[PDB]
Structure formats: structure tokens, C-alpha cells
Amino acid sequence: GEEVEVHNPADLPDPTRIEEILEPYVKLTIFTPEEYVGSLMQLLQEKRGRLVNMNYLPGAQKRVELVYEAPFAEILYDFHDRLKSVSRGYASMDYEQAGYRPGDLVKVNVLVHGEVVDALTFIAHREKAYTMARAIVDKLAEVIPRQLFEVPIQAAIGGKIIARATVKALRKDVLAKCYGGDVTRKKKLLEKQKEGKKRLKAIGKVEVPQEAFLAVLS
Amino acid sequence: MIQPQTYLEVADNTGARKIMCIRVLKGSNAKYATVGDVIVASVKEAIPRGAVKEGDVVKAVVVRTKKEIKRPDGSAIRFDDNAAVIINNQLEPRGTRVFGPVARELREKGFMKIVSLAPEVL
Amino acid sequence: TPGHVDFTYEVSRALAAVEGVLLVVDASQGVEAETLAKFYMALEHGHVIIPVINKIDLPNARPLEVALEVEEVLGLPADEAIFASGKTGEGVEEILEAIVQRIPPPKGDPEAPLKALIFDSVYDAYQGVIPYLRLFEGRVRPGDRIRIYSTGKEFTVDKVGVFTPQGLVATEALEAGEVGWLVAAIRDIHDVQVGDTITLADRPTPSPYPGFRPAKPVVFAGLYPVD
RNA sequence: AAAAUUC
RNA sequence: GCCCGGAUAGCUCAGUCGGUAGAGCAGGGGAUUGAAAAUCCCCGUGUCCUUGGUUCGAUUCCGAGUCCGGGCACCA
RNA sequence: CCGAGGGUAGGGCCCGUGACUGGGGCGGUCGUAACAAGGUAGCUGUACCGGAAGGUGCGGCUGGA
RNA sequence: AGCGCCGGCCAACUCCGUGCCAGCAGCCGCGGUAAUACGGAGGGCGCGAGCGUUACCCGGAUUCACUGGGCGUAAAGGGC
RNA sequence: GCUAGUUGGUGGGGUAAUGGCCCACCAAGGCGACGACGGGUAGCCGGUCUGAGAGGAUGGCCGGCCACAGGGGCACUGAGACACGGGCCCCACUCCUACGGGAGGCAGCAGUUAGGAAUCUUCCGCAAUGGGCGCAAGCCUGACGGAGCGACGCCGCUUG
RNA sequence: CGAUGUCGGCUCGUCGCAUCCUGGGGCUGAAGAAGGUCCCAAGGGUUGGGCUGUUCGCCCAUUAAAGCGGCACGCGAGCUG
RNA sequence: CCUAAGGUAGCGAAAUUCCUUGUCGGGUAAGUUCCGACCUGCACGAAAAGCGUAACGACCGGAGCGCUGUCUCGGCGAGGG
Ligand SMILES: [Mg+2]
Ligand SMILES: [Mg+2]
Ligand SMILES: [Mg+2]
Ligand SMILES: [Mg+2]
Ligand SMILES: [Mg+2]
Ligand SMILES: [Mg+2]
Ligand SMILES: [Mg+2]
Ligand SMILES: [Mg+2]
Ligand SMILES: [Mg+2]
Ligand SMILES: [Mg+2]
Ligand SMILES: [Mg+2]
Ligand SMILES: [Mg+2]
Ligand SMILES: [Mg+2]
Ligand SMILES: [Mg+2]
Ligand SMILES: [Mg+2]
Ligand SMILES: [Mg+2]
Ligand SMILES: [Mg+2]
Ligand SMILES: [Mg+2]
Ligand SMILES: [Mg+2]
Ligand SMILES: [Mg+2]
Ligand SMILES: [Mg+2]
Ligand SMILES: [Mg+2]
Ligand SMILES: [Mg+2]
Ligand SMILES: [Mg+2]
Ligand SMILES: [Mg+2]
Ligand SMILES: [Mg+2]
Ligand SMILES: [Mg+2]
Ligand SMILES: [Mg+2]
Ligand SMILES: [Mg+2]
Ligand SMILES: [Mg+2]
Ligand SMILES: [Mg+2]
Ligand SMILES: [Mg+2]
Ligand SMILES: [Mg+2]
Ligand SMILES: [Mg+2]
Ligand SMILES: [Mg+2]
Ligand SMILES: [Mg+2]
Ligand SMILES: [Mg+2]
Ligand SMILES: [Mg+2]
Ligand SMILES: [Mg+2]
Ligand SMILES: [Mg+2]
Ligand SMILES: [Mg+2]
Ligand SMILES: [Mg+2]
Ligand SMILES: [Mg+2]
Ligand SMILES: [Mg+2]
Ligand SMILES: [Mg+2]
Ligand SMILES: [Mg+2]
Ligand SMILES: [Mg+2]
Ligand SMILES: [Mg+2]
Ligand SMILES: [Mg+2]
Ligand SMILES: [Mg+2]
Ligand SMILES: [Mg+2]
Ligand SMILES: [Mg+2]
Ligand SMILES: [Mg+2]
Ligand SMILES: [Mg+2]
Ligand SMILES: [Mg+2]
Ligand SMILES: [Mg+2]
Ligand SMILES: [Mg+2]
Ligand SMILES: [Mg+2]
Ligand SMILES: [Mg+2]
Ligand SMILES: [Mg+2]
Ligand SMILES: [Mg+2]
Ligand SMILES: [Mg+2]
Ligand SMILES: [Mg+2]
Ligand SMILES: [Mg+2]
Ligand SMILES: [Mg+2]
Ligand SMILES: [Mg+2]
Ligand SMILES: [Mg+2]
Ligand SMILES: [Mg+2]
Ligand SMILES: [Mg+2]
Ligand SMILES: [Mg+2]
Ligand SMILES: [Mg+2]
Ligand SMILES: [Mg+2]
Ligand SMILES: [Mg+2]
Ligand SMILES: [Mg+2]
Ligand SMILES: [Mg+2]
Ligand SMILES: [Mg+2]
Ligand SMILES: [Mg+2]
Ligand SMILES: [Mg+2]
Ligand SMILES: [Mg+2]
Ligand SMILES: [Mg+2]
Ligand SMILES: [Mg+2]
Ligand SMILES: [Mg+2]
Ligand SMILES: [Mg+2]
Ligand SMILES: [Mg+2]
Ligand SMILES: [Mg+2]
Ligand SMILES: [Mg+2]
Ligand SMILES: [Mg+2]
Ligand SMILES: [Mg+2]
Ligand SMILES: [Mg+2]
Ligand SMILES: [Mg+2]
Ligand SMILES: [Mg+2]
Ligand SMILES: [Mg+2]
Ligand SMILES: [Mg+2]
Ligand SMILES: [Mg+2]
Ligand SMILES: [Mg+2]
Ligand SMILES: [Mg+2]
Ligand SMILES: [Mg+2]
Ligand SMILES: [Mg+2]
Ligand SMILES: [Mg+2]
Ligand SMILES: [Mg+2]
Ligand SMILES: [Mg+2]
Ligand SMILES: [Mg+2]
Ligand SMILES: [Mg+2]
Ligand SMILES: [Mg+2]
Ligand SMILES: [Mg+2]
Ligand SMILES: [Mg+2]
Ligand SMILES: [Mg+2]
Ligand SMILES: [Mg+2]
Ligand SMILES: [Mg+2]
Ligand SMILES: [Mg+2]
Ligand SMILES: [Mg+2]
Ligand SMILES: [Mg+2]
Ligand SMILES: [Mg+2]
Ligand SMILES: [Mg+2]
Ligand SMILES: [Mg+2]
Ligand SMILES: [Mg+2]
């Protein structure tokens, strides 16, 4: 069936049922001078868009223009600090213009220990989404305070996995009082710990208190 | 001579009655805070419906101290309590009155807000 | 004009509300990109731009060369642009007078059916909200309806100013050509756009100019608080 | 003086 | 790590003392019932954990592995 | 002397709330206690027991032959 | 000249649209393809610078019963 | 279940004046299921709405009494007040300040703001009626007489 | 083994550099300010508190910084237990 | 399948819990301890009694007030050496 919404992306009906999507791709007009076009255009090749044409305004010769359709998300990020840092702060953009897209929607889910986190769920291009996924989980490790077991962090969409993060546990203690050194006494304390780094995993519900300004902001 | 542990009686209507000093904000390891120095402090008494609830951690500037402080002209002044006034990072009071006197030394120290708000600046 | 980018929220729409904009250039820093970009914005409208070359008070500052540069670069009449200096009592002296003439004053019948769009709006009004614009055509005042073009929804007039630079001042009604402010009960801020104001209710201008209008979701997603 | 449940 | 024991039908389990392997419940075909059970009739089905060896021949005897279960890993 | 009131301490009633925990009302699993002698007549105070209705003992009632 | 209504209570009925949807509702209850009950139109009833709705009081409620009620089995005789 | 100025006595204090109204001594009393004590709510009547009536419900306008004048306490002047537009002190809050200190009180009429579903003109006049002071003339009188706004109620009239 | 007393603390240190800070550098995917990486560098400095016997670690509040090893895992004829 | 029969009430991370600082809550600026809960009880449990219990205790935990030379961080003074 057809379906309208929702602004916060994670929800949207399962790829089991889902054959359509829309990135409200605008095309924008950027005045620029001279050539920043080479730099610029390629930039608008990453945040993929669509050239119509446009025109050179008369000189200053560095007078020039470009009308491009790019999806709203890609446009925003890709554009401002870059948009200028690319062109040296000259040049400009206006997007009024709200067309829509038949393209691809792919949204990846981020999982911590397999306890899929909703807040960190993000929405990108299939190639970009593929690109982002490494950063998310990896950017994750500094974030998640340690729980007693090897602690999965992974990022993925609809059952295949774009990313991996693993968090070390390691709630080690036990051997810290053996010294005689039968090799086998050393093992005995880790046979109870190997059961404990398992039992705790199967009933493990895990959490992260704020600091999400950090993981999956970026 | 306020040091960590020192309970000092808070003299603005922020809604704090007493706070305990938990660090004196003055370098790698300052030993004591005095008049016009700033601490971090935990909140030990709050009249109901304040803005500072109890167990809050606030910054505050020392306004009065039981240990006499000396002044360039070889005079001195001690108060009968150690008091503080709860500020924010911008170093300005969240309070809107201050109660009791405050020490002149707050003035060079830029706490001008506090000084005008005072009933007497001794 | 909101200073800074601002992304064009106050740079353009309000650009609509001027007669001349005065272009201010330092003669020490030179001419920067914000400087040029704003030009074509403002150059874009159609207005009288009266140039300036500035700082001149600063000793080291390179003054003539700036006019020269804007010269070819910005394309302004080299002779036409003025010179002052702000810290100094400065090239100012001619500034207001130059402006009036370079600036033709506004035009529209002010008793004609209300068609008012205002560049901008007052902040907060946690209590009540105020508005600015020019009712270039028409007038509105107390005992008024207001109807603002896109859906309505129709708000009566508490007052209009008009606020003297000291502040927001009186008036019986706000009248045509005149640029002032109006009330009240708006409170919704989403519907409003600079080029949509209404209107008394009982007559509507057939079409808004306009300068409109605002956007659909979602940016954002949560602005969730911590702690 | 009835072993046998349910819609 | 050392020690004993286990692994056979879909699940849970017997079992040979070396030749063609069973139970109970599930599953199936029928019957009874207006119908669903319960009941009755008939039916299977296995590479008897993997590797190698002995043997005419191995689920069975022999050696190793994997996994599972039980015990020990003490004096510091 | 009294004294508005401020402060110290110990109580009393109320409201809000709380990890968790009872039950209650409204929208598949196990049985089948009641309504026909409902397939062990039912109900009942009480005691003990049981996954669940409930069973059983003691005594009672007919609103049971 | 407007506003409320037109299954029953309750004065005022036909067509079209919708198909247990959309909707109506005080209560009965309506709506699952011929709906006097939903939405519109014609027609009709009411009242008219008003006509409806919400809230609250008395009323109907002899439903706290003094006027003016009850307790074998309907709630209700105290175990004596 | 409640009560130590608690209930009565005496002698004082005080007031215009009775009284534990307050103070000293004396006696052990005073109140309560005919509901004391505590708690909740509320300004009270004339009235008003409903209702066959009994009853129920209600106290806006107006008239009468009471009580309060930012929250508290105190007295002074006085025939009379413990005094809304007088006084003193404390508390909150607003303003001034030369930082020493000061001024404030719309629950008067207009009016502003906040709260709310919601609630009026910074009008006119002392011409009447009434009040105060004055020999009078007059002066004061946001009481009051009227106007204004709102379909808010009633009543009357129009749209033939 | 006709005896070389254990973890942790305290006290007192002193030393290594495979530098945590501070000083001098090169490269940068170093615009600036901030970083990153390697090089030289051992002069000095390297906080207070919650939990636990703890060492360790976690956590609080700060800091230029909250270095890491050795010295019978320094130090019980110096203490604590 | 098995057994002689398979742990009931009550209690439960406990003077029992290994993994372990289990988890959630409370207290603290911060709580491996303490207190409340949950029940995955490695390995409680009913006269080697079970679950409670007012009063008691030079018993052993955790918290707060009061006060302090315990401590920041030490100083001076008296007597016996
Ligand atoms: Mg060793
Ligand atoms: Mg204290
Ligand atoms: Mg004070
Ligand atoms: Mg607290
Ligand atoms: Mg706390
Ligand atoms: Mg600026
Ligand atoms: Mg610059
Ligand atoms: Mg049957
Ligand atoms: Mg069934
Ligand atoms: Mg049946
Ligand atoms: Mg099997
Ligand atoms: Mg079968
Ligand atoms: Mg069959
Ligand atoms: Mg049939
Ligand atoms: Mg073989
Ligand atoms: Mg032995
Ligand atoms: Mg040992
Ligand atoms: Mg008193
Ligand atoms: Mg008192
Ligand atoms: Mg006082
Ligand atoms: Mg509760
Ligand atoms: Mg409670
Ligand atoms: Mg039955
Ligand atoms: Mg029965
Ligand atoms: Mg029966
Ligand atoms: Mg039966
Ligand atoms: Mg019985
Ligand atoms: Mg059972
Ligand atoms: Mg039984
Ligand atoms: Mg019987
Ligand atoms: Mg009607
Ligand atoms: Mg009819
Ligand atoms: Mg209708
Ligand atoms: Mg039809
Ligand atoms: Mg109807
Ligand atoms: Mg109809
Ligand atoms: Mg009428
Ligand atoms: Mg009624
Ligand atoms: Mg009637
Ligand atoms: Mg009645
Ligand atoms: Mg009646
Ligand atoms: Mg009744
Ligand atoms: Mg009667
Ligand atoms: Mg009756
Ligand atoms: Mg009887
Ligand atoms: Mg009874
Ligand atoms: Mg009885
Ligand atoms: Mg007496
Ligand atoms: Mg006596
Ligand atoms: Mg009586
Ligand atoms: Mg009252
Ligand atoms: Mg009323
Ligand atoms: Mg009255
Ligand atoms: Mg008063
Ligand atoms: Mg007063
Ligand atoms: Mg008062
Ligand atoms: Mg007099
Ligand atoms: Mg009075
Ligand atoms: Mg007074
Ligand atoms: Mg007044
Ligand atoms: Mg008023
Ligand atoms: Mg008003
Ligand atoms: Mg208002
Ligand atoms: Mg409002
Ligand atoms: Mg009036
Ligand atoms: Mg008069
Ligand atoms: Mg007169
Ligand atoms: Mg009228
Ligand atoms: Mg030895
Ligand atoms: Mg020997
Ligand atoms: Mg020797
Ligand atoms: Mg020796
Ligand atoms: Mg330690
Ligand atoms: Mg080196
Ligand atoms: Mg380094
Ligand atoms: Mg470098
Ligand atoms: Mg460097
Ligand atoms: Mg950079
Ligand atoms: Mg730099
Ligand atoms: Mg060094
Ligand atoms: Mg060193
Ligand atoms: Mg530390
Ligand atoms: Mg502590
Ligand atoms: Mg540790
Ligand atoms: Mg630094
Ligand atoms: Mg060392
Ligand atoms: Mg040693
Ligand atoms: Mg060692
Ligand atoms: Mg050692
Ligand atoms: Mg020793
Ligand atoms: Mg030792
Ligand atoms: Mg030694
Ligand atoms: Mg010991
Ligand atoms: Mg000891
Ligand atoms: Mg057991
Ligand atoms: Mg149990
Ligand atoms: Mg437990
Ligand atoms: Mg615990
Ligand atoms: Mg911890
Ligand atoms: Mg624990
Ligand atoms: Mg905890
Ligand atoms: Mg906690
Ligand atoms: Mg807490
Ligand atoms: Mg906490
Ligand atoms: Mg401790
Ligand atoms: Mg506990
Ligand atoms: Mg145990
Ligand atoms: Mg035991
Ligand atoms: Mg026993
Ligand atoms: Mg016990
Ligand atoms: Mg007991
Ligand atoms: Mg006890
Ligand atoms: Mg003892
Ligand atoms: Mg000492
Ligand atoms: Mg000494
Ligand atoms: Mg001596």
C-alpha cells in the first residue's frame, strides 16, 4: 500500500513491504564566479543531483551560474561549511524548490549489543549510507560504559550488516591471587567466568545515558 | 578560609539555605578560598520551590568569612559567618537580592552585580 | 538586517522593505565576500544602492583603492558612491540627505483595500506578539478585523505602532506608505510569512504579492533534553 | 440408580 | 588441564554382547462425530555423532576428535 | 511584663510521588465448577489441600428427590 | 433575516451521495449498496433579532417518600 | 472524648459600662452522643430560582448587618477609629539614592496588566437629590444625576 | 629452611625514559586557534575527595598535567596491621 | 526418561551468590559497603529447625546530628626521661 509519513525516519514500513521512496530533491541555483564550477560540480556529484543548464550572467566574467536538483539531506550537509570552503567563501546557493524523488531510500539501524537503539537510527543514500556506517559504530566505542561481557555494537539495515562495533567488558578479576602456579588452578577460575560471561549476556538488557550528542550526531 | 567540606550559609534568594564547598576554584591545587574567590559546592538546604534544589552542584563566590581578612592599609575585617552567593559561569548571580553585608574585595574582583545588590558593602 | 548570513531569513525578505540600502565598506580590511554576496542580494531587488568607502579615520587604511576596487569589481558608479568614516563625525554629514534623494519615497494609496505584508516580527511575546512590515497599500487600525491571506485566520486589531525610536508608539491606525507595527492575538508563528498580513477581514485584496512563506518537515527530529 | 470434555 | 559417563526415529529413551534396530509421545491414512478432541484400525521412518583401525563383515570391538553431562583443579 | 514575628526541637493529620508488588475493570492457553440428578443434588460457615475453576472433612439450609 | 430541528420520545419526508466507511448520539440506537437516523438538495415544522450548544440549580424523581416509599421471594428484620 | 484563665469565688486593674476582659490569691470545677473536641466548607438576612404544595437550591444587582483595606501587630487623636485615600513597627514586593538614606498601598471612578470561557468609557455635570465646612456669598462632593460600550436580560417596533 | 618476615597503607625518597605537563623541532589530509604523528628533551611539576583491605579500577570536582616503570613488585632493628 | 520419593510454607546476590561492583530503586557531588526490591537459590528451606519478633548486647554492618589536633598542618607550652 501507499504511505505518507513520518518525519523521523526510523519507523517506515519494512522492506518486506516497500517498493517506493522520496527524497525531496530540490535543484538550486548557485551563482558563482569564474570557475569554482569544477570543484563545485563534483561536490554535487557526491550529493548527487541533477543539472538542467542555467547560464553565465555577463561579466564580471567570473560571473556564472548552475541549476541543480539534489536531495534535501545530501544538499544540506554537503553544502555550507563546505559550500564555501570549496569555493573560497564566494558563490552562493538558494534552494527554494521542492521536487520529489523515486530513487532509493535506505535507512540503516544501529545496534548496541544487539539492543537496537532507536535514537541513533539514521537515514542516507545507499552509497552514502554505506559510507557513514563505519563511522557510527566506530565513533561509538568511546561512548558505551562497560558491562560485564564482550559487548556488541553493530550497525545495519533490514537484516544484513553495514557495520560492526565490539565493546570490551572484561570484568576480569579472578586469577589475581593465584601464585604457586598449578596451570590448572588458573583455569578453574576462568571456567566459572566463562559461564558468567555467557549467562549475563542472555539476560543482558543494556543502556546508555545521554552522550548521544556524541554517538550518531556525527 | 573556606576549604572542601566547609558548610557556608548562602546569602541570596536563589533558594539555597546552606551549601558545602567541594572544591576551591583557583588553580591546580589551591588550598583555601576566600572573599571574592569562587568555589564549586553542593547544596545542602533548600527552602521548597526554589530553582536550586537540594543536591545540586553550583558555583558560588565567597562573600563573607569568619577568618578576618587583611587589607593593604593594614586594617582588617571579619564576619560572624562564612557566606556565599550562587552564581553561573558567566560569573553573575542567579539571585536577585543579596542578604547581609559583603566585603569590599568583591569589587575589584569584578562582582559588581553583587556589590550593588548589597545592603552594605563593608 | 540581521547581521551575518543569515541564510537569508532577514537578509532578503526584509530587503523588500527598504527604499535605499546604504552599503558600508571599510577602507582598512578592504572588501569581503559577505560584502559582495549581499550586494547581489540587494542588487537583486532593484533599489538605490548608495555606496560608501569606510573607516578612513584609521591611519593605515587604504580608502581610494576601495572605491576603485568596488569600481570594477562591484560595478558601482565610481564617482557616485560617497565617503564618510563612522568613528569620525565623518562622511556622515551628507549621509541622510543623500539617502533621501537617492531614495524615492514610498508609494501606495493608504485608504485602499488592505494588502499589508511586513518584512519581520517581534520576538517572544510570551505574553503577546507584535508585527512589523509596511502596509504599503491600505491602512489598518483599532476596531479593525485583520485577515492574513493564505488560510486566514482572522485576528482583530488591538493597536498599531509605529514605535518611535525610543520605542513602540501609539497611533490610531497604521496608514499606507507608512511603515509601522500591528496587533494582536496572532499567537501562531507558523502560518505567518513576511509577504502575508491581510487585511481588514471584510475586504480582501485579491492576491498576496507576496513575500511568502514557510516550510514543511522535518529537520529536527528530537531536540531531546539530557539529564 | 448416569465413564465420556468442548463449540 | 585431569577423571568418569554419554551421543540410536521429529522429541524423550531402550538395546545388541559382531550380520536384517525397538519403545513412548508427536506425524500420517482411515474410522467414529453435526463438528474438535478422547477413543478405535492401519503406517512408516534411522547413513545408531565424526575420523581411523581390527574384522568376510561394525550401531556393537579398538584408537582419536567434537560436543554434552558429572566429579577434581589442593598446600601456599 | 506582654508582644508581631523569626529561630531550635519533637509530634499529628493531609496531598503529591516511588524500584516493586497486590488485586480490580475493559478489549489467545488450560481445563469444565455452576445452570437439567449439569452427569458426584446445590448452596453455605469453616478448616485443610490443589495449576485453575475447585475437591474433601465437620455441621447447617431447600433456594434439592 | 436568521437559526434549530424533520427514525421514536417530538411538530415536521421525498431524491441523490456514501456502503459498519465517512459520520450521527441525550437515550433507544443508526451506518455492513434502495438509510424518512450519515453528507447535500427539494419540501416541511418550530421559533424569530434572534435561534442553538455547554455549564450549573429546581423540576419531572412519592428515586430520602412530613405531605408521600419500603424490608417472605426484587436492596432491606439485628443470630438470640 | 475536650478544657489550667480551664469553671466559680474574692480583692484589684480597666472601660462609657457588665464580664477570666486582664492580674494575685482561694475552691475543683466547666463542656459533651440533645454530638462537645477536631476536620471540611461558607460572609448572614430582606430576598431569588424552581415546585401543585410541602420541599429543594441559592444570597448577583438593591436594602439591612457584619468583616477587611498588600500579609501581620500596635496604639495615638478624638463624641466616635485601634481609622481604605491618618500614625508607628515587622514581612513580602515596587520605586528613588550622592549608598548615608528615603518614598509607596485602586477591594474609590475611569484605566493598565496577569489569570480566565468571560466581564464596560483614562466620558459629562454639580442642573437635580444627598453629604461636609461656612453668618452668608460660595467652596468641596468620580456619592450622585446622566451619557458611552456589550443582544447580557426583559419589554416594545421594523424589514411592508 | 641452626629463618633472607607477606599484600595494601603511611613516611622518606632516589633513579630510568619507552615524556603525562611544561621547553625546541619536522611532516600533516598544518588557513587561523585547536589537533594528529614522529623527533630532540629527565630541569622542575605531576591536586582534592566517594567505593573497596585493596594494588587496580570506576566515579565526583578541578587541572598546564592529573605519566609509566626500577630500587628484595624500595622502605615493618622506620610506623601501621 | 528416571527415582525410595523428587524441596511444600516461608525466605532468597543472604554470616549461604561462584560468574559479581548481577539488575532496579534509596541515600552521597561521587556508594565494590549499607538499606529496599527482583529471583539466573554455581550450592536457603523447615527442631544440625524455617520465617518473624518488642526488650536486651563492652557483639558486627550502614547513615545523620553534636563536637573535636583524626586530618588540611602544624605550632607553642608543662612535667618524667
Ligand atoms: Mg609469584
Ligand atoms: Mg552541618
Ligand atoms: Mg544571610
Ligand atoms: Mg537530597
Ligand atoms: Mg542525590
Ligand atoms: Mg554584525
Ligand atoms: Mg576580516
Ligand atoms: Mg457434556
Ligand atoms: Mg477449550
Ligand atoms: Mg456440551
Ligand atoms: Mg534424541
Ligand atoms: Mg496419532
Ligand atoms: Mg481423524
Ligand atoms: Mg447447521
Ligand atoms: Mg568404522
Ligand atoms: Mg593436606
Ligand atoms: Mg595455595
Ligand atoms: Mg511568642
Ligand atoms: Mg511563635
Ligand atoms: Mg523579625
Ligand atoms: Mg501510591
Ligand atoms: Mg503514600
Ligand atoms: Mg460441570
Ligand atoms: Mg459440583
Ligand atoms: Mg454436580
Ligand atoms: Mg463431571
Ligand atoms: Mg465445605
Ligand atoms: Mg502444579
Ligand atoms: Mg483432596
Ligand atoms: Mg455435608
Ligand atoms: Mg427545535
Ligand atoms: Mg413526528
Ligand atoms: Mg444532524
Ligand atoms: Mg441510498
Ligand atoms: Mg435525529
Ligand atoms: Mg438527512
Ligand atoms: Mg424582542
Ligand atoms: Mg435532576
Ligand atoms: Mg411535568
Ligand atoms: Mg422530592
Ligand atoms: Mg413532587
Ligand atoms: Mg434510588
Ligand atoms: Mg412517610
Ligand atoms: Mg420503593
Ligand atoms: Mg430473625
Ligand atoms: Mg452480621
Ligand atoms: Mg453479630
Ligand atoms: Mg492565675
Ligand atoms: Mg487547687
Ligand atoms: Mg443542647
Ligand atoms: Mg469566605
Ligand atoms: Mg453567585
Ligand atoms: Mg448587598
Ligand atoms: Mg492593615
Ligand atoms: Mg501596613
Ligand atoms: Mg491587616
Ligand atoms: Mg472631633
Ligand atoms: Mg475597623
Ligand atoms: Mg491604617
Ligand atoms: Mg485606596
Ligand atoms: Mg478600578
Ligand atoms: Mg476594566
Ligand atoms: Mg486582561
Ligand atoms: Mg487570555
Ligand atoms: Mg456602567
Ligand atoms: Mg450638587
Ligand atoms: Mg446641593
Ligand atoms: Mg437592544
Ligand atoms: Mg628458606
Ligand atoms: Mg633444618
Ligand atoms: Mg643465622
Ligand atoms: Mg637472621
Ligand atoms: Mg587507598
Ligand atoms: Mg627520548
Ligand atoms: Mg608522546
Ligand atoms: Mg608538532
Ligand atoms: Mg609540540
Ligand atoms: Mg582547518
Ligand atoms: Mg597552530
Ligand atoms: Mg623532566
Ligand atoms: Mg620524575
Ligand atoms: Mg585523584
Ligand atoms: Mg562517607
Ligand atoms: Mg577492580
Ligand atoms: Mg595544554
Ligand atoms: Mg618511584
Ligand atoms: Mg622481599
Ligand atoms: Mg617482582
Ligand atoms: Mg616489597
Ligand atoms: Mg614489625
Ligand atoms: Mg608491610
Ligand atoms: Mg630491615
Ligand atoms: Mg589482620
Ligand atoms: Mg587488631
Ligand atoms: Mg536445594
Ligand atoms: Mg517455592
Ligand atoms: Mg537473590
Ligand atoms: Mg548489592
Ligand atoms: Mg560502581
Ligand atoms: Mg553487589
Ligand atoms: Mg545501586
Ligand atoms: Mg544510585
Ligand atoms: Mg540520587
Ligand atoms: Mg546519584
Ligand atoms: Mg569505608
Ligand atoms: Mg538487602
Ligand atoms: Mg548457597
Ligand atoms: Mg541453614
Ligand atoms: Mg532435619
Ligand atoms: Mg531472620
Ligand atoms: Mg509478632
Ligand atoms: Mg531483633
Ligand atoms: Mg556481649
Ligand atoms: Mg599533633
Ligand atoms: Mg612539644
Ligand atoms: Mg620537658
Side-chain angles (χ1 to χ4, degrees), chain A residues 1 6 8-10 13 15 17 19-20 24 28-30 33-34 36 38-40 42-46 49-52 55-56 58-60 62 65 68 70-71 73 77-78 80-82 84-85 87 89-92 94-95 97-100 102-103 106 108-109 111-114 116 119-125 128-129 131 133-135 141-142 145 147-156 158-161 163-167 169-170 172-204 206-212 214-215 218, chain B, chain C residues 1-5 8 14 16-17 19-21 23 25-33 35 37 39 42 45-47 49-52 54-56 58-61 63 65 67 69 72 74-78 81-86 88-89 91 94 97-98 100-101 104-106 108 110-113 116 119-121 125 128-129 131-134 137-139 141-144 146 148 150-152 154 156 161 165 167-168 170 173 175-177 180 183-185 192 195 201 204-206 208 210-211 214-215 217 221-222 224-226:
Chain A
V6 171
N8 242 136
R17 57 157 275 173
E19 175 206 29
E20 272 205 301
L28 33 145
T29 350
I30 295 193
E34 71 169 306
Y36 292 118
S39 252
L40 208 311
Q42 264 188 33
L43 157 51
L44 275 195
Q45 178 98 174
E46 272 169 46
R50 204 68 133 315
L51 176 54
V52 275
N55 54 102
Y56 238 43
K62 278 195 287 155
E65 162 206 56
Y68 268 80
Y77 226 174
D78 250 41
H80 212 59
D81 282 25
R82 261 173 123 154
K84 320 240 175 225
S85 233
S87 75
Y90 277 122
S92 162
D94 215 19
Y95 63 128
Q97 201 186 31
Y100 252 84
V106 185
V108 182
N109 337 271
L111 311 83
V112 58
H113 169 95
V116 61
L120 297 194
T121 341
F122 76 135
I123 179 129
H125 238 183
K128 254 110 57 138
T131 299
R134 172 61 264 220
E142 301 74 18
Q147 342 247 290
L148 291 36
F149 30 31
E150 39 278 328
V151 190
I153 304 157
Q154 51 178 84
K160 219 211 128 96
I161 321 319
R164 26 48 59 149
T166 272
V167 212
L170 63 145
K172 187 72 177 1
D173 11 311
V174 281
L175 290 188
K177 203 184 52 166
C178 307
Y179 42 96
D182 187 337
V183 64
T184 209
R185 323 177 58 183
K186 224 87 106 271
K187 284 183 182 189
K188 176 219 186 70
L189 293 194
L190 315 189
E191 162 155 341
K192 302 310 166 293
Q193 207 171 228
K194 183 61 41 51
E195 309 305 344
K197 297 316 162 195
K198 284 171 66 53
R199 281 176 265 186
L200 255 154
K201 218 154 166 56
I203 9 178
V206 73
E207 323 292 4
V208 46
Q210 58 169 106
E211 268 72 26
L214 275 175
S218 135
Chain B
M1 268 159 62
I2 308 304
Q3 103 195 221
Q5 287 306 132
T6 321
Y7 262 38
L8 44 194
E9 322 286 320
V10 4
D12 71 333
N13 48 7
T14 14
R17 282 290 165 238
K18 292 178 197 169
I19 63 176
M20 185 215 273
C21 165
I22 75 175
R23 176 113 266 228
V24 20
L25 280 169
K26 200 162 65 171
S28 171
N29 34 56
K31 228 165 263 301
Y32 317 160
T34 184
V35 165
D37 290 338
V38 166
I39 51 170
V40 174
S42 191
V43 164
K44 298 298 195 198
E45 261 174 271
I47 54 182
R49 300 157 302 276
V52 282
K53 58 211 178 200
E54 279 179 27
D56 269 348
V57 202
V58 294
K59 293 202 216 306
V61 45
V62 181
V63 215
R64 276 188 248 110
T65 55
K66 242 223 193 41
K67 166 57 135 202
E68 60 274 328
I69 101 269
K70 296 156 61 260
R71 298 225 216 90
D73 63 284
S75 74
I77 164 168
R78 68 174 155 261
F79 302 110
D80 279 27
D81 75 75
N82 306 272
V85 165
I86 312 197
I87 76 180
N88 52 42
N89 294 80
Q90 278 57 30
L91 272 260
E92 267 146 27
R94 310 213 261 142
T96 60
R97 304 181 52 200
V98 308
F99 314 89
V102 308
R104 180 138 274 120
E105 285 88 333
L106 287 162
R107 179 192 293 270
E108 321 76 72
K109 298 232 196 174
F111 287 114
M112 273 302 212
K113 258 79 185 165
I114 313 254
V115 208
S116 37
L117 261 162
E120 201 179 79
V121 175
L122 282 207
Chain C
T1 356
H4 310 53
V5 67
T8 71
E19 272 324 317
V21 276
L23 153 306
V25 184
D26 148 292
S28 75
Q29 286 229 29
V31 51
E32 258 125 326
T35 234
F39 181 119
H45 258 180
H47 251 335
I49 53 192
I50 304 122
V52 174
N54 214 351
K55 304 294 185 16
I56 55 174
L58 194 145
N60 155 205
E65 319 202 6
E69 218 166 5
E72 112 64 73
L74 271 277
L76 292 204
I82 322 181
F83 291 47
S85 134
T88 349
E94 67 259 27
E97 178 97 317
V100 45
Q101 60 130 175
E111 183 112 38
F119 52 67
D120 224 359
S121 83
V129 218
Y132 308 128
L133 19 24
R134 145 209 196 171
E137 334 232 327
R139 62 251 233 123
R141 30 69 130 312
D144 214 54
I146 82 70
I148 39 146
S150 55
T151 51
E154 37 159 298
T156 40
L168 8 293
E175 278 187 337
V183 270
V192 71
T205 191
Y224 316 103
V226 309

